[PDB]
Amino acid sequence: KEQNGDVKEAASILQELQVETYGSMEKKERVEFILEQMRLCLAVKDYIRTQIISKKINTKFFQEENTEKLKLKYYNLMIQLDQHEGSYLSICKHYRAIYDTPCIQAESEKWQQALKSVVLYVILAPFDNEQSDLVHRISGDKKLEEIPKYKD
Amino acid sequence: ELREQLKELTKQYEKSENDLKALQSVGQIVGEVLKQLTEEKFIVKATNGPRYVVGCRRQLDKSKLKPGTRVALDMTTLTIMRYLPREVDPLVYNMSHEDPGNVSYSEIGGLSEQIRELREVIELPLTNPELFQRIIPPKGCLLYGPPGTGKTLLARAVASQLDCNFLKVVSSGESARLIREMFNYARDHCIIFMDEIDALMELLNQMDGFDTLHRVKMIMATNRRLDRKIHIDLPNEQARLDILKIHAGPEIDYEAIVKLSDGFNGADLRNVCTEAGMFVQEDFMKAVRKVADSKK
Amino acid sequence: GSELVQKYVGEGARMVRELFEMARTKKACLIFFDEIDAIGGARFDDGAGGDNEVQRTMLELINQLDGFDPRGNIKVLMATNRPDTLDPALMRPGRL
Amino acid sequence: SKMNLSEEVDLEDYVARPDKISGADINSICQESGMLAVRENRYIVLAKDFEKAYKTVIKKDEQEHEFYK
Amino acid sequence: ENSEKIKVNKTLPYLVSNVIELLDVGKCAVIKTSTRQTYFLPVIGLVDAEKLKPGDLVGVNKDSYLILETLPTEYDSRVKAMEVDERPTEQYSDIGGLDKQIQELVEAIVLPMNHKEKFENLGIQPPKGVLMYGPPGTGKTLLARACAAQTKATFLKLAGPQLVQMFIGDGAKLVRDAFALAKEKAPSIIFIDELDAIGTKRFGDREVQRTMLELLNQLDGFQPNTQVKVIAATNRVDILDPALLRSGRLDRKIEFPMPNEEARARIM
Amino acid sequence: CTKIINADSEDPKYIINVKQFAKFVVDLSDQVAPTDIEEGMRVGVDRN
Ligand SMILES: Nc1ncnc2c1ncn2[C@@H]1O[C@H](COP(=O)(O)OP(=O)(O)O)[C@@H](O)[C@H]1O
Numbered sequence: 001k002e003q004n005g006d007v008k009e010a011a012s013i014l015q016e017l018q019v020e021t022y023g024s025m026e027k028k029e030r031v032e033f034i035l036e037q038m039r040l041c042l043a044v045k046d047y048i049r050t051q052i053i054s055k056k057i058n059t060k061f062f063q064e065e066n067t068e069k070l071k072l073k074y075y076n077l078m079i080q081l082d083q084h085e086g087s088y089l090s091i092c093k094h095y096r097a098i099y100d101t102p103c104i105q106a107e108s109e110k111w112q113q114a115l116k117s118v119v120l121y122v123i124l125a126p127f128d129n130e131q132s133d134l135v136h137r138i139s140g141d142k143k144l145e146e147i148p149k150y151k152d
Numbered sequence: 153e154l155r156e157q158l159k160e161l162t163k164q165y166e167k168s169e170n171d172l173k174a175l176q177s178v179g180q181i182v183g184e185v186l187k188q189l190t191e192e193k194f195i196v197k198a199t200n201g202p203r204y205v206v207g208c209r210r211q212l213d214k215s216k217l218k219p220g221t222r223v224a225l226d227m228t229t230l231t232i233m234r235y236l237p238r239e240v241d242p243l244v245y246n247m248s249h250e251d252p253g254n255v256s257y258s259e260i261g262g263l264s265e266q267i268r269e270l271r272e273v274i275e276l277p278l279t280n281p282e283l284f285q286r287i288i289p290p291k292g293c294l295l296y297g298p299p300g301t302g303k304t305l306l307a308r309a310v311a312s313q314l315d316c317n318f319l320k321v322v323s324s325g326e327s328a329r330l331i332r333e334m335f336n337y338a339r340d341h342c343i344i345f346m347d348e349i350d351a352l353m354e355l356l357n358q359m360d361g362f363d364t365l366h367r368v369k370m371i372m373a374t375n376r377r378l379d380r381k382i383h384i385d386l387p388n389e390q391a392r393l394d395i396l397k398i399h400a401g402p403e404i405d406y407e408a409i410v411k412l413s414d415g416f417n418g419a420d421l422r423n424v425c426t427e428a429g430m431f432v433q434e435d436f437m438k439a440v441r442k443v444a445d446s447k448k
Numbered sequence: 449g450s451e452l453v454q455k456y457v458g459e460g461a462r463m464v465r466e467l468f469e470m471a472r473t474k475k476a477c478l479i480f481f482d483e484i485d486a487i488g489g490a491r492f493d494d495g496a497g498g499d500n501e502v503q504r505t506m507l508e509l510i511n512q513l514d515g516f517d518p519r520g521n522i523k524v525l526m527a528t529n530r531p532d533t534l535d536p537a538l539m540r541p542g543r544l
Numbered sequence: 545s546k547m548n549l550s551e552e553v554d555l556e557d558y559v560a561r562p563d564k565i566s567g568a569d570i571n572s573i574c575q576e577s578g579m580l581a582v583r584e585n586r587y588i589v590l591a592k593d594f595e596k597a598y599k600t601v602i603k604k605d606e607q608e609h610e611f612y613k
Numbered sequence: 614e615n616s617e618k619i620k621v622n623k624t625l626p627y628l629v630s631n632v633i634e635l636l637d638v639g640k641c642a643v644i645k646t647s648t649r650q651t652y653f654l655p656v657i658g659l660v661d662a663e664k665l666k667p668g669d670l671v672g673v674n675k676d677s678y679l680i681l682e683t684l685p686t687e688y689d690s691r692v693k694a695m696e697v698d699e700r701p702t703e704q705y706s707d708i709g710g711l712d713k714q715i716q717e718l719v720e721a722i723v724l725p726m727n728h729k730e731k732f733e734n735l736g737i738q739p740p741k742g743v744l745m746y747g748p749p750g751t752g753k754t755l756l757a758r759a760c761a762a763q764t765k766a767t768f769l770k771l772a773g774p775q776l777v778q779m780f781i782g783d784g785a786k787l788v789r790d791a792f793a794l795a796k797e798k799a800p801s802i803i804f805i806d807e808l809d810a811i812g813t814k815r816f817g818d819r820e821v822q823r824t825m826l827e828l829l830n831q832l833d834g835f836q837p838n839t840q841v842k843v844i845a846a847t848n849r850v851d852i853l854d855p856a857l858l859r860s861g862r863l864d865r866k867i868e869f870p871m872p873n874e875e876a877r878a879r880i881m
Numbered sequence: 882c883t884k885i886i887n888a889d890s891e892d893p894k895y896i897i898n899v900k901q902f903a904k905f906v907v908d909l910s911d912q913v914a915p916t917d918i919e920e921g922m923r924v925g926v927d928r929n
């Protein structure tokens with residue numbers, strides 16, 4: 001339905017699958033279903049339902065073997081949500097999780113862009129104790145290297 | 153030889169001299185602060201009963217001694233020398249102070265309808281309560297019908313499913329007061345399980361229903377806010393086979409057994425294996441003979 | 449009868465034990481528990497939880513009169529004007 | 545007022561209807577309606593929710609023996 | 614010379630004390646002096662901290678209350694004389710009427726006691742606790758005497774009021790001594806007559822309740838091994854501490870019935 | 882005396898219970914025959 005150049009009625013159908021209670025194999029298939037519910041919600045711009053559905057996931061699970069692309073898309077979707085909402089420190093934290101993902105560590109740009117956006121989203125937050133702590137943590141981090149006219 | 157000899161003799165000399173050192177250490181008096189007088193004074197009740205206004209050792213710091221803080225009172229000057237953790241008395245696990253303890257989820261073979269119902273009962277509040285705040289999460293529920301066929305087992309499995317550990321309690325005036333008092337630690341430890349409500353000349357145990365940190369719920373269960381009713385059937389339709397199999401720690405035989413056995417739980421299979429042992433597969437008709445023999 | 453209901457919970461049971469020990473010390477004994485309606489009627493508690501020490505010494509008297517122990521040449525002539533509130537444990541003819 | 549409600553959820557047509565409910569009853573109606581709304585997974589309650597809670601805690605005083613009346 | 618100094622400072626009027634609780638700050642102690650008191654100690658003292666488990670008989674200096682020599686064991690005379698000095702001998706077949714009850718008790722007591730491995734060989738649980746609830750006069754103590762006679766092992770005669778000493782904690786000490794004696798003398802059968810005297814339902818009274826909870830806790834301490842099997846006996850089970858008859862605890866209810874007609878013929 | 886502590890061969894190191902007061906471990910003083918204690922024989926004891 002979503003492929004069929006029509007989306008207003010796309011989110012509705014899939015926003016009826018409680019893969020939490022459907023009683024399936026393990027936390028792979030249902031994580032995928034929840035994430036596609038979320039993707040459809042973002043596509044239709046239903047941010048309240050986006051947050052509510054995202055609350056169904058437990059990020060602690062993503063410390064597992066195959067849990068790489070699923071958590072990557074999880075954080076990317078949360079980041080779309082927050083970017084259209086207005087928060088910036090939350091977007092910082094989400095990019096930080098993306099960067100800390102072991103797979104994301106590999107390949108040059110897959111971490112260079114992550115750190116670029118992490119630093120900008122630290123900078124684009126209000127001056128609070130939390131923002132100051134994040135500024136300190138991202139400060140240098142060794143790997144921040146001397147990205148030209150950037151770490152300065 | 154010198155290395156080991158001198159190593160062991162150094163151990164022995166150090167131990168002996170430290171024994172002499174210990175021989176000049178005086179014990180303290182174990183007691184609890186009561187009221188925290190002017191910040192240089194505390195009313196402390198020693199174990200044997202007597203209560204003294206006592207000092208506060210400077211390096212000890214303050215604000216860590218509040219009414220009930222075990223302290224090591226100085227034996228003569230009666231000064232609070234250094235605090236202590238709360239002693240664990242036998243009145244903890246018998247007072248139902250157990251957070252952990254679970255067996256499995258597959259241990260409950262069938263029961264799918266009640267599993268799903270209680271799941272929808274207790275998950276969402278332990279997980280997202282903000283949705284409700286957008287109003288009051290349900291607090292209690294009921295497990296009902298026959299003697300709650302696998303009531304505590306239902307809790308034992310679905311709590312593990314939800315990842316919140318446990319707070320079990322039995323309901324078999326002072327007792328009521330303290331049962332509500334340890335609610336502080338209960339929340340500090342979730343699904344609360346005040347079971348055995350039946351069997352009541354007690355009147356302070358009323359449903360006080362205080363306010364605690366959001367999340368954490370209860371499944372208060374009995375027979376005959378908290379708005380649920382999980383009716384249960386003492387047998388199952390065709391899950392007696394299932395109960396036997398998932399209890400078969402030790403199948404046509406399993407059918408032939410359930411086809412005439414009508415009990416309430418896996419005690420049937422427990423008796424099967426037990427009497428077969430008196431008389432691992434190779435049992436077969438022995439189970440049938442048991443189930444025919446059990447009286448109940 | 450009144451020298452078996454003291455304060456100091458357990459003292460009464462200790463008294464019963466000492467009496468039976470003295471009996472066994474003696475060659476042939478006749479005990480004459482009188483007014484035993486004071487020492488032990490029923491066993492139900494309800495509000496009698498505070499008066500359970502007498503019940504306890506009565507239980508000690510039973511276990512002495514007959515239990516996992518030969519009693520010896522000890523013969524008991526209990527007296528009671530009302531053997532209608534006595535405990536069936538004490539009344540049962542293994543002891544009387 | 546504390547809850548979040550739609551625009552077609554007028555309460556003024558849940559009062560004019562004769563009914564011998566009390567304050568506890570009305571609190572229960574509202575709490576049950578919100579609970580049912582969340583169960584059916586919406587974050588805004590609606591007239592159907594209030595109808596269902598109304599009938600859930602108005603006719604609850606039933607299952608009596610009818611020969612008494 | 615340091616050893617001589619320690620010897621000179623180890624005079625021998627030590628006070629017997631417990632080790633109720635332990636802590637690390639180094640090692641410390643929270644000993645409970647028999648002179649009913651609770652004394653904390655920073656430097657555990659001459660004890661080499663052999664894991665110093667909560668619960669132990671330690672010789673402790675009278676005034677400094679420092680842990681001097683540790684004592685091996687202490688079982689009051691009331692539990693040292695509390696065993697079958699002369700094993701009785703009545704019979705097994707000479708207990709009329711009750712047949713299913715006697716068979717059930719024989720299995721659930723002796724068979725796990727003799728053929729221990731050929732119970733768990735089948736994934737079986739030989740329940741530790743057998744409660745004989747009967748109407749007064751059925752013969753519960755008769756079957757108990759028969760088991761003590763023809764069962765070997767070490768038999769413990771627990772006698773209800775025998776656990777209710779006036780002094781606070783002495784009853785719990787007596788129960789601890791009884792259970793420890795059972796464990797040391799394993800295989801053991803622990804027959805508790807008139808269990809309605811250790812603790813009935815509620816609550817000196819708190820002392821009786823505390824000794825009851827000592828019984829409950831140390832019974833729970835059992836595992837399938839630790840070859841001690843407990844057989845409570847009791848006349849009036851007027852809902853006697855439902856917590857007592859729970860999972861793990863006394864859980865084989867050997868109900869005792871009144872003698873039927875054939876039973877009475879056999880009895881006569 | 883409730884436990885003669887196995888007597889450790891030499892240096893018996895008796896034990897005693899003064900009942901409500903306390904439970905002490907004790908030696909023998911001036912006693913001619915340090916065997917006549919019988920492990921329950923209601924022995925003598927000094928104050929301090
Ligand atoms: N679905 C099941 N799978 C395995 N065992 C079960 C099941 N249901 C009940 N049982 C057994 O029945 C017993 C019932 O325990 P519990 O529910 O606490 O007591 P009651 O059923 O009398 O309330 C448990 O010990 C358990 O071994």
Ligand SMILES: Nc1ncnc2c1ncn2[C@@H]1O[C@H](COP(=O)(O)OP(=O)(O)O)[C@@H](O)[C@H]1O
Pocket residue numbers: 542707708709710711747748749750751752753754755756846848872880
């Ligand atoms: N079933 C029985 N078979 C044989 N003797 C019995 C039986 N029941 C009671 N007795 C007689 O009574 C006594 C045993 O009953 P007992 O065990 O003392 O009862 P309880 O357990 O209620 O105290 C013995 O004197 C025995 O001779």
Ligand SMILES: [Mg+2]
Pocket residue numbers: 300301302303304305306
């Ligand atoms: Mg259960």
